[PDB]
Amino acid sequence: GRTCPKPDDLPFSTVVPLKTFYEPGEEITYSCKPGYVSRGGMRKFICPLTGLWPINTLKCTPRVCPFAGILENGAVRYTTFEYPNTISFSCNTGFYLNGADSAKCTEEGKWSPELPVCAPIICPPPSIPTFATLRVYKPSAGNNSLYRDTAVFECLPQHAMFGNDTITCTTHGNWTKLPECREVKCPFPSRPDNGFVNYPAKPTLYYKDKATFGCHDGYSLDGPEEIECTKLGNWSAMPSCKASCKVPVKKATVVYQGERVKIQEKFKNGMLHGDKVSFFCKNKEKKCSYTEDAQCIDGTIEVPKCFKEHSSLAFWKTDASDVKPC
Numbered sequence: 001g002r003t004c005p006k007p008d009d010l011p012f013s014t015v016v017p018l019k020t021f022y023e024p025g026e027e028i029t030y031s032c033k034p035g036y037v038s039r040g041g042m043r044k045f046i047c048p049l050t051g052l053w054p055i056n057t058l059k060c061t062p063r064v065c066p067f068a069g070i071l072e073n074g075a076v077r078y079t080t081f082e083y084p085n086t087i088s089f090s091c092n093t094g095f096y097l098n099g100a101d102s103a104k105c106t107e108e109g110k111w112s113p114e115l116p117v118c119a120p121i122i123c124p125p126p127s128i129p130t131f132a133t134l135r136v137y138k139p140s141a142g143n144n145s146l147y148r149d150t151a152v153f154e155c156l157p158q159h160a161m162f163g164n165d166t167i168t169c170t171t172h173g174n175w176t177k178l179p180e181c182r183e184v185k186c187p188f189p190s191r192p193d194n195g196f197v198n199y200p201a202k203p204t205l206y207y208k209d210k211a212t213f214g215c216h217d218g219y220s221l222d223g224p225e226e227i228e229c230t231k232l233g234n235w236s237a238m239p240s241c242k243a244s245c246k247v248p249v250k251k252a253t254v255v256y257q258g259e260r261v262k263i264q265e266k267f268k269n270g271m272l273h274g275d276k277v278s279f280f281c282k283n284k285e286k287k288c289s290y291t292e293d294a295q296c297i298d299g300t301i302e303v304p305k306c307f308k309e310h311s312s313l314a315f316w317k318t319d320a321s322d323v324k325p326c
Ligand SMILES: *[C@@H]1O[C@H](CO)[C@@H](O[C@@H]2O[C@H](CO)[C@@H](O)[C@H](O)[C@H]2NC(C)=O)[C@H](O)[C@H]1NC(C)=O
Pocket: 172, 174, 175, 176, 177
């Protein structure tokens, strides 16, 4: 033969000068592409008189960047550390990435942008809001605090806290929002009719100050015995003394709080304001018993009209409460 044909294309290389045929004596050069290297450098060949290119031992492989699989206190994502490839980084809880979160292996076999390290998230000591004291706080990293650490505030006596009392060290190295500590006063509480109120003897009453109520005999509170001044400047509650009821019949079996009682027994000293019971009424038609409710309301309770109280003298008839349910 008289010319060499087009040279073969090796995998990650280029041939210069690339023609489709060569005269004997012409030279070509194989070079590995940028980012690749091969054993033995580049290969030059001269087209021989036979027109047959010789054997080519060129095997181009990617440069490998230095090992980068271990990020202290974090995690690298990689297939392999070869020239085309990029790796990415993240940090374990409590740490942040000091540097870029990915890097590439360059043509020159170096990492760019250059590998990061993980560092602990820290916060400076928190500031104390302007009427508050620092209840719980201990630094965990020199003078500073670590991520998810907390501090707890306590307002000064007679001051009410608006907002959560605990702050946390966040990822941004600042704390969550601080609370405020305002002074709050309450009016004096009303003495209730047929009762009395008690509260500390001082010219003015503040947040968390407490007042207690009582009722004269024949009356009970319709609210809580103790109340306190809330953060909003009013009182926890304001109960009255409501009137009890004389028991409204002499002998009857009633439902009280889901269970049968003898009303003359359970309520021998009257019924308190609010007490509900259920009286037993006789459905004369179907010969069975049903109940209907009745409540003591400030000294009044109204017995259902269907209720018939048999004097125990008339023992020849049966109480509605002894008749089978409907
Ligand atoms: C803690 O610091 C970060 C600053 O990086 C604050 O977050 C920024 O808040 C403003 C307004 O709330 C936003 O417009 C920004 O987009 C936020 N930036 C980021 C990166 O989140 C945060 O408000 C600060 N916390 C406190 C309690 O001051």
